[PDB]
Amino acid sequence: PSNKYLVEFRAGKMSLKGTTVTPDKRKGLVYIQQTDDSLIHFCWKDRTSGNVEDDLIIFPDDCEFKRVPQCPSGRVYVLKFKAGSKRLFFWMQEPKTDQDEEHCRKVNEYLNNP
Amino acid sequence: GPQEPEPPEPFEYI
């Protein structure tokens, strides 16, 4: 028996430089995990290596996870840290869109509820 | 498995 992710979905990363957001081509996975100290972790894993390469401890009202309407060739989402300039960008990698909005809802619900 | 989408094009964020 092992603790399971609260939500997970396939997604790649993108990087912002200056004003330009450019995709990273790797297959990845966004997930939210509650560790046994009750803390909530927003994570990104490289699906090819299996390496967890982002692991952020998030508290209620730190963040919003929002669709980015400025990109028409993908389903791009941003984890925005409301207090400063920190932003993490992701592009959905599920073949269909029919769970995108539910995944977005669940991310916001788990990050912003105590 | 079903083919995953191609990466999006770069875009402007300000």
């Binding site: 100290d37 803390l39 927003f42 952020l56 401890i57 998030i58 508290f59 209620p60 730190d62 840290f81 207090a83 400063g84 920190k86 105590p114 | -």
Partner: protein, 72 residues
């Protein structure tokens, strides 16, 4: 400069700090105000656990920031 420290369910406190204050200096200030020993404190900001040996400036912590305090 003024910052805030808050546990998930606990009190908010204010601290007077400078950008050059180290994380261990901040934990000592929390102990002075709340009686919590430094070894029982984890401080988190912008998704990152703040490590002893670094300063507030290293983490871009600016005035009126809230640090999240997690206790054992």
């Amino acid at each position: 400069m003024q910052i805030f420290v808050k546990t998930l369910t606990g009190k908010t406190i204010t601290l007077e700090v400078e950008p050059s204050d180290t994380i261990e200096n901040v934990k000592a200030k929390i102990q002075d105000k709340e009686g919590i020993p430094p070894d029982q404190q984890r401080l988190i900001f912008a998704g990152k656990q703040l490590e002893d040996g670094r300063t507030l400036s290293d983490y871009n912590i600016q005035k009126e920031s809230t640090l999240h305090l997690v206790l054992r």
